[PDB]
Structures are given as C-alpha cells and as structure tokens.
Amino acid sequence: STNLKDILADLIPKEQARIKTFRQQHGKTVVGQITVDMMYGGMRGMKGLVYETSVLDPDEGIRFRGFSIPECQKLLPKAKGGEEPLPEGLFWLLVTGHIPTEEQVSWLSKEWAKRAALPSHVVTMLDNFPTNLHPMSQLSAAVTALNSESNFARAYAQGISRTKYWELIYEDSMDLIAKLPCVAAKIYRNLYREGSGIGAIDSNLDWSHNFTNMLGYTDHQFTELTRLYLTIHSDHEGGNVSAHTSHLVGSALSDPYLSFAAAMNGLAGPLHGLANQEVLVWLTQLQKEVGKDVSDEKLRDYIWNTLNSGRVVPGYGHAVLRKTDPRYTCQREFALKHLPNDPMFKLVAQLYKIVPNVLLEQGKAKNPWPNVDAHSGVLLQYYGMTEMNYYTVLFGVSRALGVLAQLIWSRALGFPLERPKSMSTEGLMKFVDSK
Amino acid sequence: STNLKDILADLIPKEQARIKTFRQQHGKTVVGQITVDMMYGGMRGMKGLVYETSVLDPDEGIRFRGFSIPECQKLLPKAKGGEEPLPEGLFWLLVTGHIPTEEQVSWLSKEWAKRAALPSHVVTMLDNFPTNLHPMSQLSAAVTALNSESNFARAYAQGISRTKYWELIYEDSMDLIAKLPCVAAKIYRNLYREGSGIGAIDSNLDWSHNFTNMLGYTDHQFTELTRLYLTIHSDHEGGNVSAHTSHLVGSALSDPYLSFAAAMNGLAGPLHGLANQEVLVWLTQLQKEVGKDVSDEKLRDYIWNTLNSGRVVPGYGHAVLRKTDPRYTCQREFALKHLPNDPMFKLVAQLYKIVPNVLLEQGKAKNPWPNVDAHSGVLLQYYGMTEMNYYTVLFGVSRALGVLAQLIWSRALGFPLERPKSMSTEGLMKFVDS
Ligand SMILES: [Cl-]
Numbered sequence: 106s107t108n109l110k111d112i113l114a115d116l117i118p119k120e121q122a123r124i125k126t127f128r129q130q131h132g133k134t135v136v137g138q139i140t141v142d143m144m145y146g147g148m149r150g151m152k153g154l155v156y157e158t159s160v161l162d163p164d165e166g167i168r169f170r171g172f173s174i175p176e177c178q179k180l181l182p183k184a185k186g187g188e189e190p191l192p193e194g195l196f197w198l199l200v201t202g203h204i205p206t207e208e209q210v211s212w213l214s215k216e217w218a219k220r221a222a223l224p225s226h227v228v229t230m231l232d233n234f235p236t237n238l239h240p241m242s243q244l245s246a247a248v249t250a251l252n253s254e255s256n257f258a259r260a261y262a263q264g265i266s267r268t269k270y271w272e273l274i275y276e277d278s279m280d281l282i283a284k285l286p287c288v289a290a291k292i293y294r295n296l297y298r299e300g301s302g303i304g305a306i307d308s309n310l311d312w313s314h315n316f317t318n319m320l321g322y323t324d325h326q327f328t329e330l331t332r333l334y335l336t337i338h339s340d341h342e343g344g345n346v347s348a349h350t351s352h353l354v355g356s357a358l359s360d361p362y363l364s365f366a367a368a369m370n371g372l373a374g375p376l377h378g379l380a381n382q383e384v385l386v387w388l389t390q391l392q393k394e395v396g397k398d399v400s401d402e403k404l405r406d407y408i409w410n411t412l413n414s415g416r417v418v419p420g421y422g423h424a425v426l427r428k429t430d431p432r433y434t435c436q437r438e439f440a441l442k443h444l445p446n447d448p449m450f451k452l453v454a455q456l457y458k459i460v461p462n463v464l465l466e467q468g469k470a471k472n473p474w475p476n477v478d479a480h481s482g483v484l485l486q487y488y489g490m491t492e493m494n495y496y497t498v499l500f501g502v503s504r505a506l507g508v509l510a511q512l513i514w515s516r517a518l519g520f521p522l523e524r525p526k527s528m529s530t531e532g533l534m535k536f537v538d539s540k
Numbered sequence: 541s542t543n544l545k546d547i548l549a550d551l552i553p554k555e556q557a558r559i560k561t562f563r564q565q566h567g568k569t570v571v572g573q574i575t576v577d578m579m580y581g582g583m584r585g586m587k588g589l590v591y592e593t594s595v596l597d598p599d600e601g602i603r604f605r606g607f608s609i610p611e612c613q614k615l616l617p618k619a620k621g622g623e624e625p626l627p628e629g630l631f632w633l634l635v636t637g638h639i640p641t642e643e644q645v646s647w648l649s650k651e652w653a654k655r656a657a658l659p660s661h662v663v664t665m666l667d668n669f670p671t672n673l674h675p676m677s678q679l680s681a682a683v684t685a686l687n688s689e690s691n692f693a694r695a696y697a698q699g700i701s702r703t704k705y706w707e708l709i710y711e712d713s714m715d716l717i718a719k720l721p722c723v724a725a726k727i728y729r730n731l732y733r734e735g736s737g738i739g740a741i742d743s744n745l746d747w748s749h750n751f752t753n754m755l756g757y758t759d760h761q762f763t764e765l766t767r768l769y770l771t772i773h774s775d776h777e778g779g780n781v782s783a784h785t786s787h788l789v790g791s792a793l794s795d796p797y798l799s800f801a802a803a804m805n806g807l808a809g810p811l812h813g814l815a816n817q818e819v820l821v822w823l824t825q826l827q828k829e830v831g832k833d834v835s836d837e838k839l840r841d842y843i844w845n846t847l848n849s850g851r852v853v854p855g856y857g858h859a860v861l862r863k864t865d866p867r868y869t870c871q872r873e874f875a876l877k878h879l880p881n882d883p884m885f886k887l888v889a890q891l892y893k894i895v896p897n898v899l900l901e902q903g904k905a906k907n908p909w910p911n912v913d914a915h916s917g918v919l920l921q922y923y924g925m926t927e928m929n930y931y932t933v934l935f936g937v938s939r940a941l942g943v944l945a946q947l948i949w950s951r952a953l954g955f956p957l958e959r960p961k962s963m964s965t966e967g968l969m970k971f972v973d974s
C-alpha cells in the first residue's frame with residue numbers, strides 16, 4: 106500500500122516474464138550495426154544498454170516512465186502549500202512506473218528522514234578535508250567511505266541468493282539517497298560557511314527541505330526551486346557518463362555506494378558536469394560588458410559576432426530534440442512567477458527571444474532551442490547559491506534518484522556483468538582485411 | 541633517449557596519421573551486428589571500444605603490445621640480483637610498444653621514487669579511517685582525494701589546447717603510479733600492523749621493492765613475487781570492468797586520479813576483483829577436509845562430487861582461452877623454484893594434474909584449464925600476506941599500469957566522450973515492431 110518494497114516485490118516477476126518472452130521472440134533480432142567509426146567515436150549511435158527509467162522523446166523531451174516533464178509537474182505530489190513536484194514522488198515513479206499518491210510520497214519522505222544518519226568516520230573525514238579539495242571529490246570520497254554501511258556487500262559475502270540481490274540494493278539505495286543531502290550540506294558548510302554545523306534532520310519535512318535547512322537557507326522559494334531542480338535533473342537515459350558509470354560498476358555487484366561514487370567521478374568530468382557553470386560564466390561576462398538594459402538589436406549583434414567568430418551560444422542547440430527542453434521551460438515558468446525583474450533572468454529571457462531566430466537564420470545547428478543548463482545558474486544565483494564549483498554536487502544529488510532507481514531494476518532483472526569486446530588499431534586492421 | 545615523455549611525443553603523430561588513414565578507408569565498414577540479446581546481456585560479444593595496450597590471443601593468452609607473457613619474462617629488465625621482470629619495463633612497453641633497455645627502466649624507477657610523496661591531507665584521512673572500512677574503499681577514497689594534485693584538472697580549467705591533453709595526463713599518471721604503493725602500504729599497515737609507519741622511499745630502489753619495504757616485508761623472494769605479480773596483472777584488454785570504467789570516466793576528461801578511483805570501485809565488485817580470494821577460500825576448506833597427503837583418486841572423487849552437485853571448481857572452467865593461462869604458468873614456475881614443498885602449493889599442483897581431465901571428461905565447460913586466479917593466493921599466503929581482503933588492492937596497483945598507459949593514448953588520439961544509446965524494454969519492443 107505505502108511500503109514501496111512490497112509493491113516492488115509484486116512488480117518484479119511480471120516484468121521478468123515480459124522480458125523473458127520478448128527475448129525468446131526477438132533476442133536474435135538486429136537493432137544496429139557496429140562500424141569502425143563507432144569504436145573510435147565512443148560508441149556514438151550504438152544501441153548498447155537497456156535502461157528502463159527514462160527515455161528521450163524527440164518531440165517532448167525526456168520522459169520518466171512514459172510521463173513527460175509537464176505531466177510530472179501536474180500529477181506528482183507537491184509539498185503542502187507549494188507548487189513544485191517533490192523528488193520523492195519522482196523516485197517512486199521511476200521505481201514503480203506509477204504516479205504515487207500523497208500518502209505514498211509522505212511515507213517516502215519519512216523513510217528518507219529516518220535513514221539520514223552519517224557514521225562518525227564519514228563526519229570526521231569531511232571535517233578534515235582541506236578547502237582546496239574540490240566539492241565533487243569530497244562527495245565521491247565520502248560516498249565511497251559510506252560503503253562500510255552497505256548491507257548488500259555483507260549479504261553477498263555470506264552467499265545470499267541471486268533472487269534477493271534487489272532487496273539489499275533497494276535498502277542501500279534508500280540509505281544512500283537519505284544520506285546524500287547530509288554529505289552534500291556538510292561539504293557546503295565546510296567549504297563556504299567556515300565549518301559551521303548542518304543542524305538536525307526533521308522527521309516531518311520532505312527531503313528537499315531538510316536539504317535546504319542543512320545548507321543554511323530559510324527561503325520558501327529556494328526550497329521550491331530545489332524541489333523542482335532535484336526532480337528535473339534526476340534521470341536522462343543510460344548513455345550519459347554518470348548513468349553509464351553507475352550501471353557498469355553496478356554490473357560487477359559493487360554496492361550502490363561504490364557505484365554512485367564512481368558515477369560522481371564521471372559527473373565531475375568537464376564534458377559532463379560543468380555546462381550550468383559555463384552558461385553562467387558566459388552570462389555574467391555578457392552582462393558586465395553590455396549592461397542590464399541592452400537592446401534587442403545590440404544583443405542580436407553580440408550573438409552574430411559570437412557565431413561569426415566560430416563560437417557557440419552556451420546552452421543552445423540539440424541534435425534530436427525538436428523543441429525547447431521542457432526542463433528549461435519549467436525553470437522559465439518558475440522565474441516568470443517569482444523573479445521576473447531579476448536583471449540576470451531578464452537577460453536569459455531576452456536570449457530566448459533572440460538566439461533561436463539567429464541560429465535558425467545561420468542555418469547551422471539543427472535544433473536551435475535551449476536546454477536545462479541555459480537556465481539553472483541564474484535561479485541558483487538569485488537565491489544566494491553563488492558557489493559555482495558546488496553546482497555539480499546539486500546535479501549529483503538529483504542524479505542519484507535516477508541511477509539508483511535503475512540499479513534496483515538491473516539487479517531485479519539479473520542484468521549481467523557489462524563486458525564489451527575491445528580491439529586495438531592493429532587488431533581492427535587485421536579484422537577488416539579478412540572479409 | 542631515456543625521457544619517456546619525449547619518446548612518446550615522437551610516437552604520437554605517426555599513430556594519429558595511421559588511425560586517420562584507416563578511418564578514411566574503413567570508417568564505415570561494418571564489424572558486427574547488435575542484437576537485442578547483446579543489449580540485455582551487458583554488450584557480450586559486441587566490439588565496442590578501441591584499447592591499444594593489450595590484446596587477448598585465443599591461442600596464446602594475453603599479449604602486451606604483441607609480446608606474449610613468456611617473451612616479456614625473457615626480454616624485460618630485471619632487478620640487479622633478481623630474475624622476475626620489473627613492472628617499470630612493462631609500463632614502458634605498454635606506453636611505447638617497445639621493449640625498454642636497462643637505462644630506460646633504471647630512469648623510470650628513479651622517476652617513480654622522486655614523485656612518491658603524499659599530501660598531508662591524504663595521510664590524515666588514511667590515518668583516521670576505521671578498521672571496518674574495506675581496503676578497496678580506502679584505496680578509492682584516497683585516490684579520489686589525491687585529485688587535488690592533478691595538473692590536468694588545473695590546466696583544463698585554464699583552456700589548454702586539445703593537442704596537449706596527453707602531456708598533463710602523462711604527468712598525473714606518473715605521479716599516481718608513484719604514489720600508489722605509498723597509499724596501498726599505508727592502508728595495509730593501518731589495518732594489519734597497528735598503524736605503524738611506512739618508512740621512507742629509497743631513491744635507488746625499484747617500485748616493487750620500495751612497495752614491499754613500505755608494506756613491512758624483508759624477504760627477497762617476496763619482492764620477486766611482487767614484481768612478477770604486478771607485471772602480469774597489469775592489463776587484460778579494455779572490456780573488463782576496471783579498464784572500461786577508467787576509459788569511460790576518462791572520456792569525460794576526468795583526470796587520472798578520478799578515473800583510476802572509479803576503476804577501483806569497479807574492481808571491488810565481486811564479479812571482477814575477488815576470484816583470487818574465492819580460489820583460496822575453496823582450497824583452504826578442501827585441505828582442511830581431506831588433509832595435506834590426499835591421494836589422486838580421492839581428490840578426483842571430490843572434484844566429481846563438486847561438479848555433479850552443479851558447482852564449479854574456482855579458477856578453472858572459464859570461456860576465454862583454449863589452454864592454460866600463461867599467467868598461471870608463470871606462477872607455477874615461480875612456485876616450483878621457491879616453494880615446491882609448501883602443502884598448499886602441492887594441492888594447487890595436484891589440482892592442475894586432475895581438474896582439467898575431469899572437466900574434459902564431463903564435456904561441459906569450454907576451457908578446462910586454469911586462469912591466473914587459481915594460483916596467486918597460495919603464493920601470497922606462503923610469504924605471510926594472509927589478509928585476503930587486501931588482495932584486490934594488489935591487483936589494483938598492478939592494473940594502474942595498464943589502464944593509465946591506455947589513458948595517455950586515449951587522450952593523445954583524441955578519443956571522444958563514451959556515449960552509447962540506451963533503450964528501455966518498452967522502447968526496444970516498439971523499435972523492433974516498426
Ligand atoms: Cl545528463
């Protein structure tokens with residue numbers, strides 16, 4: 106009814122049988138070809154993994170168990186008196202395939218509050234990290250050190266049945282998600298508030314609100330933002346580096362602490378976890394140059410000069426998505442309600458009005474619309490979350506929801522060790538010459 | 541001449557041109573099909589990545605830049621007064637494609653000695669870890685915290701040219717390899733020697749010997765073992781979880797500290813890093829039961845009972861090769877020279893005599909021959925390295941050589957972000973229907 110674990114236990118068999126049947130008829134069906142270029146190009150365009158939780162729709166954007174972002178915005182429970190969807194309900198959705206009721210979200214909020222405690226060795230470790238150790242490094246180190254709490258690792262060493270892997274993975278995943286905001290806020294306070302305390306978990310608050318309290322914020326609108334943010338960054342298919350890394354590491358039966366810590370090292374990569382920061386750096390320098398009251402014409406000129414010097418507008422352009430990323434639109438709506446007169450937001454809006462028509466006219470980038478990263482920085486910054494190094498940590502806490510939801514399923518469905526075949530250049534040359 | 545970095549700078553262009561030409565002609569050539577079964581089966585049999593440092597020959601075993609294990613054993617430099625190949629020379633081989641001279645190995649040994657220092661925050665952190673935090677967790681946490689030393693991370697944030705990525709990756713990789721034995725021995729001592737100190741790096745010793753000194757061992761033959769061990773576990777293609785994880789994380793321009801730390805979380809996985817320990821647990825239970833003077837007949841019976849109850853003999857019966865893993869044979873040779881009368885070794889040998897014949901007769905498993913993991917534990921155990929949790933850390937330090945050698949090449953050749961396409965079950969069902 107409200108126990109997610111029991112609901113999950115009923116869903117799993119039906120899903121194993123469905124996959125069994127599908128593999129009997131279509132197991133040998135060809136879905137793609139592998140070319141030399143694909144091996145050298147980082148498996149680009151190669152369908153290589155099954156990842157259940159989310160799928161990118163070319164017309165609507167990312168879908169969470171079939172539900173578009175606007176549908177999630179509407180149907181997922183909100184906090185009492187709030188308007189943004191709670192991350193709890195997103196997790197329930199990714200895990201079950203079903204929109205949770207109020208009671209179910211409320212139950213999950215209490216679970217994550219109860220399981221929040223950090224062992225003292227992780228507290229000590231975080232408290233002794235120096236201020237030059239990047240926040241993502243601290244996050245991944247702390248999560249790795251949390252694996253001493255892993256009930257999966259202990260049960261595996263005692264010879265537990267394969268049919269039960271998902272249960273321990275579920276437990277550890279729930280513990281980890283509960284603990285993450287505590288780790289993340291400890292890092293924030295140690296780095297940017299001179300080591301002051303995170304205060305206590307409140308057992309009747311939702312996950313985002315306990316998170317904002319521990320960060321030291323007291324602004325209802327910031328909490329609403331954080332709920333929306335944690336919800337919308339939660340998952341984006343299996344192929345991105347953080348999802349794929351958690352999947353790959355998890356396929357060796359490394360526990361969730363270890364899989365999520367590996368994923369964060371992937372997320373810390375500049376080609377994955379920095380786009381928010383890059384947009385914001387660019388916006389800041391833009392506004393310092395041309396001033397807040399820049400005209401449409403002058404901004405349109407600046408954008409033409411940016412393009413004509415062979416540079417891109419950060420946050421604009423997608424290869425498959427045919428409209429504005431609905432994750433951008435969510436943020437835009439939020440900003441129009443709560444900070445419409447913020448000079449930086451007004452620049453972001455002005456660019457939405459101008460950049461796509463300029464990109465359409467240049468005829469170069471296929472879909473000239475913005476993605477989530479074009480909007481997120483100005484919102485964080487407006488509420489005083491100005492430490493750009495830390496933004497990737499927020500992304501990380503959100504992304505836990507999606508990759509741990511799938512990890513439970515990967516173990517429930519018995520996904521094996523991920524082991525593609527490598528070749529050397531020499532080997533591939535021989536291989537193509539025979540034939 | 542001896543500066544590996546300059547030699548590497550000359551090799552890189554020739555290799556970029558070679559790959560450019562091969563892609564112009566054969567870029568669109570099909571090398572395989574993807575099936576639904578492959579997506580559900582963890583990409584099994586799908587040629588998915590380019591990894592230059594090592595290749596598995598189905599007739600020979602693993603090859604290091606074309607050289608088989610017995611050839612490496614012969615050609616690679618040894619320590620003064622020693623017989624086992626130094627890991628230094630293996631690294632040089634993987635990095636250059638060439639067997640290093642004496643001078644070159646000697647130069648590399650000095651490099652790794654000079655760069656060995658740990659920052660104090662990593663020392664503090666290791667010194668505060670509790671005894672219930674698994675050694676692989678401590679290893680990965682410490683390496684992640686070492687990323688504050690990363691010159692690649694700083695140069696990238698300053699906008700350095702793509703053509704120079706490999707240089708900084710080389711530097712950080714050399715620093716990491718240097719530091720790893722210090723991290724690993726600090727963990728060993730904190731866990732199993734009551735927090736005693738690791739002592740100092742000696743500038744004139746090779747990497748393995750500084751490593752054994754820091755662990756607290758003073759047995760020449762153990763140092764020889766460690767050299768052989770670190771050499772032979774160094775690389776095994778790109779598709780295993782630790783290599784692939786370093787490759788995937790590295791493709792996002794995460795520095796070597798972060799890539800290697802992720803790889804170790806993968807290695808800590810029971811389906812990847814535990815086979816050594818599993819063989820040894822099984823051997824221990826076997827020898828407790830039947831005693832050290834067991835007959836061939838009685839052992840043959842035990843193995844038949846093991847198989848007939850639907851269980852496997854650990855270390856034997858994998859799908860990879862046609863014949864004995866040459867990495868097993870290396871260890872067997874070692875044991876025959878240095879500990880031929882060890883009761884546990886004598887069991888290992890007795891199993892080599894009997895298990896394959898039984899598996900051949902059962903007709904079930906494709907390869908009835910043993911791999912490296914069937915032999916390594918008894919050797920470690922003989923020299924007093926009895927802490928089985930720690931064995932994966934040794935594997936880790938060895939595996940650094942192979943994955944960091946390739947990481948330098950991946951950045952030299954401009955390999956992009958690894959980004960395959962995922963599908964859901966529902967999505968794949970739609971996809972096959974239209
Ligand atoms: Cl993503």
Ligand SMILES: [Cl-]
Pocket residue numbers: 776780
């Ligand atoms: Cl391996």
